[PDB]
CSV table of C-alpha atoms and ligand atoms in Angstrom, one decimal:
chain,number,residue,atom,x,y,z
X,7,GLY,CA,-6.6,8.1,-3.5
X,8,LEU,CA,-8.6,4.6,-3.8
X,9,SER,CA,-10.2,3.1,-0.8
X,10,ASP,CA,-10.5,-0.4,-0.2
X,11,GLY,CA,-13.6,-1.1,-1.9
X,12,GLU,CA,-12.4,1.1,-4.9
X,13,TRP,CA,-9.2,-1.3,-5.3
X,14,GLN,CA,-11.7,-4.1,-5.1
X,15,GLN,CA,-13.3,-3.3,-7.7
X,16,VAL,CA,-11.1,-2.4,-10.6
X,17,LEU,CA,-9.3,-6.2,-9.3
X,18,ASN,CA,-12.9,-7.0,-10.2
X,19,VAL,CA,-13.2,-5.8,-13.2
X,20,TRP,CA,-10.2,-6.6,-14.0
X,21,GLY,CA,-10.6,-10.3,-13.9
X,22,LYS,CA,-13.0,-10.3,-16.1
X,23,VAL,CA,-10.3,-8.3,-18.4
X,24,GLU,CA,-8.0,-11.8,-18.2
X,25,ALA,CA,-10.5,-14.3,-19.1
X,26,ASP,CA,-10.4,-13.0,-22.7
X,27,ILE,CA,-7.1,-10.3,-22.7
X,28,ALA,CA,-7.1,-11.2,-26.8
X,29,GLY,CA,-10.0,-9.1,-27.7
X,30,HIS,CA,-9.9,-6.7,-24.6
X,31,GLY,CA,-7.0,-6.0,-26.3
X,32,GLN,CA,-7.7,-5.8,-29.8
X,33,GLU,CA,-10.6,-3.7,-28.7
X,34,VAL,CA,-8.5,-0.5,-26.5
X,35,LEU,CA,-6.4,-0.5,-29.9
X,36,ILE,CA,-8.8,0.2,-32.0
X,37,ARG,CA,-10.6,2.7,-29.8
X,38,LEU,CA,-7.4,4.6,-29.4
X,39,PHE,CA,-6.4,4.5,-33.1
X,40,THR,CA,-9.8,5.4,-34.4
X,41,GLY,CA,-10.4,8.3,-31.4
X,42,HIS,CA,-6.5,9.2,-31.5
X,43,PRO,CA,-5.1,8.9,-35.4
X,44,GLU,CA,-1.8,10.5,-34.5
X,45,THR,CA,-1.7,7.4,-32.2
X,46,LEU,CA,-1.2,4.7,-34.7
X,47,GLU,CA,1.5,6.7,-36.0
X,48,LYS,CA,4.0,5.7,-32.9
X,49,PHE,CA,3.2,2.1,-34.0
X,50,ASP,CA,5.5,0.8,-37.5
X,51,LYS,CA,4.4,-1.8,-37.8
X,52,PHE,CA,0.1,-0.9,-37.4
X,53,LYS,CA,0.8,2.5,-39.4
X,54,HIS,CA,-0.6,1.3,-43.1
X,55,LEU,CA,-3.8,0.3,-40.9
X,56,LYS,CA,-6.5,2.3,-42.2
X,57,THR,CA,-10.3,0.9,-41.0
X,58,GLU,CA,-11.6,-0.8,-37.5
X,59,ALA,CA,-11.6,-3.7,-39.8
X,60,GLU,CA,-8.1,-3.7,-41.1
X,61,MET,CA,-7.2,-3.3,-37.7
X,62,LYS,CA,-9.7,-6.6,-36.5
X,63,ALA,CA,-7.4,-8.5,-38.9
X,64,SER,CA,-4.0,-7.7,-38.3
X,65,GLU,CA,-2.8,-10.4,-36.0
X,66,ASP,CA,0.0,-8.5,-34.8
X,67,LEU,CA,-2.4,-5.9,-33.5
X,68,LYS,CA,-4.3,-8.6,-31.3
X,69,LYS,CA,-0.7,-9.5,-29.6
X,70,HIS,CA,0.8,-6.5,-28.6
X,71,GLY,CA,-3.0,-4.9,-27.5
X,72,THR,CA,-2.6,-9.0,-24.7
X,73,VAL,CA,0.8,-7.6,-24.1
X,74,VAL,CA,-0.1,-4.0,-23.0
X,75,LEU,CA,-3.4,-5.4,-20.7
X,76,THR,CA,-1.1,-8.5,-19.5
X,77,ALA,CA,1.2,-5.1,-17.9
X,78,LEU,CA,-1.1,-2.4,-16.9
X,79,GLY,CA,-2.7,-5.5,-14.4
X,80,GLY,CA,0.1,-6.8,-13.6
X,81,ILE,CA,0.9,-2.8,-12.5
X,82,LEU,CA,-1.9,-2.0,-11.2
X,83,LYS,CA,-2.4,-5.8,-8.8
X,84,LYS,CA,0.9,-4.5,-7.3
X,85,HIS,CA,-0.2,-0.9,-6.4
X,86,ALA,CA,-3.4,-2.5,-4.8
X,87,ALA,CA,-1.2,-4.7,-2.7
X,88,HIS,CA,1.7,-1.6,-1.3
X,89,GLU,CA,-1.5,0.1,-1.5
X,90,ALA,CA,-3.5,-2.1,1.2
X,91,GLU,CA,-0.7,-2.0,3.5
X,92,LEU,CA,0.1,1.4,3.7
X,93,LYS,CA,-3.0,2.7,3.6
X,94,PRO,CA,-4.4,1.7,7.1
X,95,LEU,CA,-0.2,2.3,9.1
X,96,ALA,CA,-0.8,6.0,7.6
X,97,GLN,CA,-4.2,5.7,8.4
X,98,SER,CA,-3.6,4.9,12.6
X,99,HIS,CA,0.1,7.0,12.3
X,100,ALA,CA,-2.2,9.9,11.0
X,101,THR,CA,-5.6,10.1,12.9
X,102,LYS,CA,-5.1,7.7,16.4
X,103,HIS,CA,-1.3,7.6,17.1
X,104,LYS,CA,-0.9,10.9,15.8
X,105,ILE,CA,3.2,10.6,15.1
X,106,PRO,CA,5.2,13.6,13.1
X,107,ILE,CA,6.9,12.3,9.7
X,108,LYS,CA,10.2,13.5,12.1
X,109,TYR,CA,9.6,10.7,14.6
X,110,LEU,CA,9.5,8.3,11.7
X,111,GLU,CA,13.3,9.6,10.4
X,112,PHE,CA,14.2,8.8,14.1
X,113,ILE,CA,13.0,5.1,14.2
X,114,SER,CA,14.7,4.8,11.2
X,115,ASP,CA,17.7,5.9,12.4
X,116,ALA,CA,17.4,3.5,15.1
X,117,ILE,CA,16.7,0.9,12.5
X,118,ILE,CA,20.0,1.6,10.1
X,119,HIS,CA,21.8,1.4,13.5
X,120,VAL,CA,20.6,-1.5,15.1
X,121,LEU,CA,21.4,-3.4,11.6
X,122,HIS,CA,25.3,-1.6,11.3
X,123,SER,CA,25.8,-3.2,14.3
X,124,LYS,CA,24.3,-6.8,14.7
X,125,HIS,CA,24.9,-7.7,11.1
X,126,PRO,CA,27.8,-5.6,10.1
X,127,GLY,CA,28.5,-8.2,7.3
X,128,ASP,CA,25.5,-8.2,5.8
X,129,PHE,CA,25.8,-4.4,6.2
X,130,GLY,CA,28.0,-2.4,4.2
X,131,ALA,CA,28.8,1.6,3.0
X,132,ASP,CA,26.9,0.2,0.1
X,133,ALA,CA,23.8,-1.7,1.6
X,134,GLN,CA,23.3,0.6,4.5
X,135,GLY,CA,23.3,3.1,2.0
X,136,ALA,CA,20.1,1.2,-0.2
X,137,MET,CA,18.4,0.7,3.6
X,138,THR,CA,18.6,4.5,4.3
X,139,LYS,CA,17.1,5.2,0.2
X,140,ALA,CA,14.5,2.5,1.0
X,141,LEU,CA,13.8,4.0,4.3
X,142,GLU,CA,13.2,7.8,2.6
X,143,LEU,CA,11.3,6.0,0.7
X,144,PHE,CA,8.9,4.9,3.2
X,145,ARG,CA,8.5,8.1,5.2
X,146,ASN,CA,7.3,10.4,1.3
X,147,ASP,CA,4.5,7.4,0.8
X,148,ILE,CA,3.9,7.6,4.9
X,149,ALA,CA,4.0,12.1,3.9
X,150,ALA,CA,2.3,12.0,0.8
X,151,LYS,CA,-1.3,9.6,3.0
X,152,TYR,CA,-0.5,12.5,5.7
X,153,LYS,CA,-1.1,15.3,3.4
X,154,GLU,CA,-3.9,13.2,1.7
X,155,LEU,CA,-5.4,12.9,5.7
X,156,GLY,CA,-4.5,17.2,6.2
X,157,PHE,CA,-1.9,15.3,9.1
X,158,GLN,CA,0.0,18.7,9.9
X,159,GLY,CA,2.7,16.8,11.2
T,30,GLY,CA,14.3,5.0,-6.4
T,31,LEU,CA,17.0,1.8,-6.2
T,32,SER,CA,19.2,-0.7,-8.9
T,33,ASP,CA,18.2,-4.7,-8.6
T,34,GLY,CA,21.5,-4.9,-6.5
T,35,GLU,CA,20.0,-1.9,-3.7
T,36,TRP,CA,16.6,-3.7,-3.8
T,37,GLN,CA,18.9,-7.0,-3.4
T,38,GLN,CA,20.6,-5.8,-0.4
T,39,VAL,CA,17.7,-4.3,1.1
T,40,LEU,CA,16.1,-8.3,0.9
T,41,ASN,CA,18.9,-9.9,1.7
T,42,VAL,CA,19.6,-7.7,5.1
T,43,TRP,CA,15.8,-8.1,6.0
T,44,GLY,CA,16.4,-11.9,5.4
T,45,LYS,CA,18.9,-12.0,8.7
T,46,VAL,CA,16.1,-9.5,10.3
T,47,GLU,CA,13.5,-12.4,9.7
T,48,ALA,CA,15.4,-14.5,11.7
T,49,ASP,CA,15.4,-13.2,15.2
T,50,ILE,CA,12.7,-10.4,14.3
T,51,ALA,CA,11.3,-10.4,18.0
T,52,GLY,CA,14.9,-9.2,19.0
T,53,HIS,CA,15.8,-6.6,16.7
T,54,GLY,CA,13.1,-4.5,17.3
T,55,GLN,CA,12.9,-4.7,21.2
T,56,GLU,CA,16.4,-2.9,20.1
T,57,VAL,CA,15.4,-0.5,17.5
T,58,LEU,CA,12.6,0.4,19.8
T,59,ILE,CA,14.8,0.9,23.1
T,60,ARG,CA,17.3,2.3,20.8
T,61,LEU,CA,14.8,5.2,19.7
T,62,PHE,CA,13.6,5.5,23.3
T,63,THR,CA,16.3,6.7,24.6
T,64,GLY,CA,17.9,8.9,21.6
T,65,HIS,CA,14.9,10.0,21.8
T,66,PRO,CA,12.1,10.4,24.9
T,67,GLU,CA,9.2,12.2,23.5
T,68,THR,CA,8.5,9.5,20.9
T,69,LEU,CA,7.9,7.1,24.0
T,70,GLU,CA,5.6,9.9,25.2
T,71,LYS,CA,3.1,8.7,22.0
T,72,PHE,CA,2.8,5.2,23.1
T,73,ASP,CA,0.4,4.9,26.5
T,74,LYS,CA,1.4,1.4,27.2
T,75,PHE,CA,4.8,1.7,27.2
T,76,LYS,CA,5.5,5.6,29.1
T,77,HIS,CA,5.7,3.8,32.4
T,78,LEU,CA,8.7,3.0,31.5
T,79,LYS,CA,11.7,5.1,33.1
T,80,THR,CA,14.6,2.6,32.5
T,81,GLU,CA,16.4,1.0,29.5
T,82,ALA,CA,15.3,-2.0,32.1
T,83,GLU,CA,12.3,-1.9,33.1
T,84,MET,CA,12.0,-2.3,29.0
T,85,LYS,CA,14.2,-4.8,27.8
T,86,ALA,CA,11.8,-6.6,30.7
T,87,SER,CA,8.9,-6.1,29.1
T,88,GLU,CA,7.3,-8.8,26.9
T,89,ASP,CA,5.1,-6.7,25.0
T,90,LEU,CA,7.8,-4.4,23.8
T,91,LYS,CA,9.2,-6.8,22.5
T,92,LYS,CA,5.8,-8.1,20.8
T,93,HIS,CA,4.9,-4.7,18.9
T,94,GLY,CA,9.2,-4.1,18.1
T,95,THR,CA,7.8,-7.4,16.1
T,96,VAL,CA,5.2,-6.5,14.8
T,97,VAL,CA,6.5,-2.9,13.7
T,98,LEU,CA,9.7,-5.1,11.2
T,99,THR,CA,6.4,-7.3,10.1
T,100,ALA,CA,4.5,-4.5,9.1
T,101,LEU,CA,7.6,-2.3,7.3
T,102,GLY,CA,9.4,-5.6,5.9
T,103,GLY,CA,5.7,-6.0,4.0
T,104,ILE,CA,5.0,-2.3,2.9
T,105,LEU,CA,9.3,-2.0,1.5
T,106,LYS,CA,8.6,-5.3,-0.4
T,107,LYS,CA,5.7,-4.8,-1.9
T,108,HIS,CA,7.0,-1.3,-2.9
T,109,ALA,CA,10.1,-2.9,-5.2
T,110,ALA,CA,7.6,-5.8,-6.5
T,111,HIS,CA,5.9,-2.3,-7.9
T,112,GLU,CA,8.9,-0.5,-8.6
T,113,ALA,CA,9.6,-3.9,-10.3
T,114,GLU,CA,7.0,-3.7,-13.4
T,115,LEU,CA,7.2,0.2,-13.7
T,116,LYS,CA,10.8,0.9,-14.2
T,117,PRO,CA,11.2,-0.7,-17.5
T,118,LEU,CA,7.7,0.5,-18.5
T,119,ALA,CA,8.8,4.2,-17.7
T,120,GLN,CA,12.4,3.1,-19.6
T,121,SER,CA,10.8,2.1,-23.4
T,122,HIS,CA,8.0,4.8,-23.0
T,123,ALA,CA,10.8,7.5,-22.4
T,124,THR,CA,13.4,6.8,-24.3
T,125,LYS,CA,12.7,4.4,-26.9
T,126,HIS,CA,8.5,4.9,-28.0
T,127,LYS,CA,8.9,8.7,-26.8
T,128,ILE,CA,5.6,8.5,-25.4
T,129,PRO,CA,3.7,11.5,-23.9
T,130,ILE,CA,1.4,11.3,-20.7
T,131,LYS,CA,-1.4,12.9,-23.6
T,132,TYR,CA,-1.3,9.2,-25.0
T,133,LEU,CA,-1.3,7.4,-22.1
T,134,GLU,CA,-4.4,10.0,-21.4
T,135,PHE,CA,-5.9,8.0,-24.8
T,136,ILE,CA,-5.6,4.7,-23.9
T,137,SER,CA,-6.5,5.2,-20.5
T,138,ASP,CA,-9.9,6.6,-22.4
T,139,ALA,CA,-9.9,3.9,-24.1
T,140,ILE,CA,-9.8,1.1,-21.6
T,141,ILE,CA,-12.7,2.8,-19.4
T,142,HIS,CA,-14.8,3.0,-23.2
T,143,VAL,CA,-14.3,-1.1,-23.7
T,144,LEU,CA,-14.8,-1.6,-20.3
T,145,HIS,CA,-18.5,0.9,-20.0
T,146,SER,CA,-19.5,-0.7,-23.1
T,147,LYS,CA,-18.6,-4.1,-22.7
T,148,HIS,CA,-18.5,-5.0,-18.9
T,149,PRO,CA,-21.6,-2.6,-17.8
T,150,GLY,CA,-22.3,-5.6,-15.2
T,151,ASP,CA,-19.1,-4.9,-12.8
T,152,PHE,CA,-18.2,-1.4,-14.8
T,153,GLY,CA,-21.4,1.2,-13.2
T,154,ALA,CA,-20.2,4.5,-11.7
T,155,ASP,CA,-18.3,4.0,-9.2
T,156,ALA,CA,-16.5,1.1,-10.2
T,157,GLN,CA,-15.7,3.1,-14.0
T,158,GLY,CA,-15.0,5.8,-11.3
T,159,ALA,CA,-12.1,3.4,-9.9
T,160,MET,CA,-10.6,2.7,-12.8
T,161,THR,CA,-10.3,6.2,-13.8
T,162,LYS,CA,-8.5,6.9,-10.4
T,163,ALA,CA,-6.6,3.7,-11.2
T,164,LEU,CA,-5.5,4.2,-14.7
T,165,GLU,CA,-4.6,8.1,-13.5
T,166,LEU,CA,-1.9,7.0,-10.3
T,167,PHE,CA,-0.8,4.8,-13.3
T,168,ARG,CA,0.3,7.5,-15.3
T,169,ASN,CA,1.8,9.8,-12.5
T,170,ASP,CA,3.9,7.2,-11.7
T,171,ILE,CA,5.0,6.9,-15.0
T,172,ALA,CA,5.2,10.4,-15.4
T,173,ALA,CA,7.6,10.7,-11.6
T,174,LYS,CA,9.6,8.4,-13.7
T,175,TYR,CA,10.0,10.2,-16.7
T,176,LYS,CA,11.3,13.8,-15.0
T,177,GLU,CA,14.3,11.0,-13.2
T,178,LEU,CA,15.0,10.2,-16.5
T,179,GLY,CA,14.4,13.6,-18.2
T,180,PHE,CA,11.8,13.0,-20.9
T,181,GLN,CA,8.9,15.9,-20.6
T,182,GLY,CA,6.2,13.5,-21.2
D,27,HEM,C1,-1.6,1.0,-20.2
D,27,HEM,C2,-0.3,2.1,-20.9
D,27,HEM,C3,0.9,1.3,-21.5
D,27,HEM,C4,0.9,-0.4,-21.4
D,27,HEM,C5,0.9,-1.1,-20.1
D,27,HEM,C6,2.6,-0.4,-22.5
D,27,HEM,C7,2.5,-1.4,-22.5
D,27,HEM,C8,4.0,-1.8,-23.5
D,27,HEM,C9,4.4,-2.9,-23.7
D,27,HEM,C10,4.4,-3.9,-22.6
D,27,HEM,C11,6.0,-2.8,-24.8
D,27,HEM,C12,6.5,-3.9,-24.5
D,27,HEM,C13,7.8,-3.9,-23.7
D,27,HEM,C14,8.0,-2.6,-23.8
D,27,HEM,O1,8.7,-2.4,-25.3
D,27,HEM,O2,8.3,-1.7,-23.5
D,27,HEM,C15,4.8,-1.8,-25.1
D,27,HEM,C16,5.3,-1.2,-26.2
D,27,HEM,C17,5.1,-0.5,-27.0
D,27,HEM,N1,4.4,0.0,-26.5
D,27,HEM,FE1,2.9,0.6,-24.6
D,27,HEM,N2,2.0,0.5,-23.5
D,27,HEM,C18,1.3,1.6,-23.2
D,27,HEM,C19,0.5,2.4,-23.5
D,27,HEM,C20,1.2,3.0,-24.5
D,27,HEM,C21,1.3,4.5,-25.4
D,27,HEM,C22,-0.2,5.2,-25.5
D,27,HEM,C23,2.3,4.4,-26.7
D,27,HEM,C24,1.6,4.6,-27.6
D,27,HEM,C25,0.9,6.0,-28.1
D,27,HEM,C26,2.5,2.9,-26.4
D,27,HEM,C27,3.4,2.5,-27.6
D,27,HEM,C28,4.3,1.4,-27.7
D,27,HEM,C29,5.3,1.5,-28.8
D,27,HEM,C30,5.7,2.2,-29.9
D,27,HEM,C31,5.8,0.3,-28.2
D,27,HEM,C32,6.7,-0.9,-29.2
D,27,HEM,C33,5.7,-1.7,-30.2
D,27,HEM,C34,6.6,-2.7,-30.7
D,27,HEM,O3,7.9,-2.7,-31.2
D,27,HEM,O4,6.8,-4.1,-31.6
D,27,HEM,N3,2.7,2.6,-25.3
D,27,HEM,N4,4.2,-1.2,-24.7
D,28,HEM,C1,9.0,1.6,10.2
D,28,HEM,C2,7.9,2.7,11.2
D,28,HEM,C3,6.4,2.0,11.7
D,28,HEM,C4,5.9,1.3,12.0
D,28,HEM,C5,6.5,0.7,10.5
D,28,HEM,C6,4.3,0.8,13.0
D,28,HEM,C7,4.4,-0.1,11.9
D,28,HEM,C8,3.0,-0.2,13.5
D,28,HEM,C9,1.5,-0.8,13.6
D,28,HEM,C10,1.2,-2.0,12.4
D,28,HEM,C11,0.9,-1.2,14.5
D,28,HEM,C12,0.0,-1.8,15.2
D,28,HEM,C13,-1.1,-1.1,14.2
D,28,HEM,C14,-1.7,-0.3,13.9
D,28,HEM,O1,-2.0,0.4,15.0
D,28,HEM,O2,-1.1,0.8,12.7
D,28,HEM,C15,1.6,0.4,15.5
D,28,HEM,C16,1.0,0.8,16.4
D,28,HEM,C17,1.8,2.5,16.5
D,28,HEM,N1,2.9,2.5,16.1
D,28,HEM,FE1,4.2,2.1,15.0
D,28,HEM,N2,5.5,1.8,13.4
D,28,HEM,C18,6.0,2.4,12.8
D,28,HEM,C19,6.2,3.6,13.6
D,28,HEM,C20,6.0,4.3,14.7
D,28,HEM,C21,6.8,5.6,15.3
D,28,HEM,C22,7.7,6.1,15.4
D,28,HEM,C23,5.6,5.9,16.8
D,28,HEM,C24,5.9,6.3,17.7
D,28,HEM,C25,6.8,7.8,18.0
D,28,HEM,C26,5.2,5.1,16.6
D,28,HEM,C27,4.0,5.2,17.6
D,28,HEM,C28,2.8,4.1,17.2
D,28,HEM,C29,2.1,3.5,18.4
D,28,HEM,C30,2.1,4.8,19.3
D,28,HEM,C31,1.2,2.2,18.4
D,28,HEM,C32,-0.3,2.2,19.2
D,28,HEM,C33,0.7,1.5,19.6
D,28,HEM,C34,-0.5,-0.1,21.4
D,28,HEM,O3,-1.2,1.6,21.6
D,28,HEM,O4,-0.2,-0.9,21.2
D,28,HEM,N3,4.7,4.5,15.0
D,28,HEM,N4,3.1,0.8,14.6
D,29,CO,CO1,5.8,2.1,-0.9
D,30,CO,CO1,1.5,1.7,-9.5
D,31,O,O1,2.1,-0.5,-25.9
D,32,O,O1,5.1,1.7,16.1
């Protein structure tokens, strides 16, 4: 896992990328295609390109390089924002509060019941099943952080 | 994982909680402590409450109810926002493009290389280490989806 300052280092350098995404995208695919030419074979519109000069001249490769870094940028920013909220929760529940995963199952059961009983119109079998799965994802994320810190519970 | 409609149910359902989070929180915690009393003994500020009467009467149990459901709401929203960008990318690259994990390593190395080259000033040893881990987490997320869909990456 990444520390708070590491995630901030990644967002910090990604700001520099987004400021000239067209050029960065170009260089990254040329770096890919020259270093590992088997990768060029997946791209119908590019596999004809033989040299760095032809690849730099390809408007298609330029535009796809931007499509790739735009998508990556968005996914890393989303990953970082999930971690900024998950990490301190996991940290405190592990080391200070000392809450076994089982107890998080208990509170998950409670959340489902209170929701069924207070908002049954908005909480059918399908929503109840959706909310059940979402709370399992939340506990598995805490659980994957508990193993990292070596918290036994 | 969950379908777009499932997440939308969870998010709809969450809306009805945010209308009265104080009350919802209070009942979840009271339902938790009555059902499983060992959970009350992790709260050094609530373990003096013996009855449901004392518990409904606690200003701070109620305020802690709001803290729990707020944080849980926040984290599930960020979880869903990450998935919504991971899923389509994993889908297309597994089923249509058929891109093995190995190739995602190559493009990861290329991004790191071009950032070392073009932006040393925002990309020293620590920042490079940070990005290396961040792209590892990205590949793992993709690899986890590859398993679900049956694609051998
Ligand atoms: C960080 C890594 C990557 C990102 C963020 C990324 C992102 C994308 C995006 C957004 C698309 C267009 C929408 C889509 O089809 O899903 C795309 C298309 C594609 N990607 Fe990737 N990709 C990555 C790595 C790779 C690698 C390593 C390869 C091949 C070696 C690859 C091959 C392709 C191909 C063939 C297409 C279709 C191109 C076309 O039809 O014009 N991707 N990629
Ligand atoms: C959905 C599940 C849970 C969420 C979202 C959650 C969230 C939080 C938050 C945001 C805090 C305050 C910040 C912090 O210290 O980390 C907190 C504190 C705490 N949580 Fe949790 N929690 C959950 C489940 C549990 C369970 C099951 C227990 C115990 C059985 C527990 C015990 C505590 C304790 C003891 C504190 C310290 C309270 C104090 O001294 O004032 N949590 N929780
Ligand atoms: Co999560
Ligand atoms: Co991710
Ligand atoms: O790509
Ligand atoms: O909590």
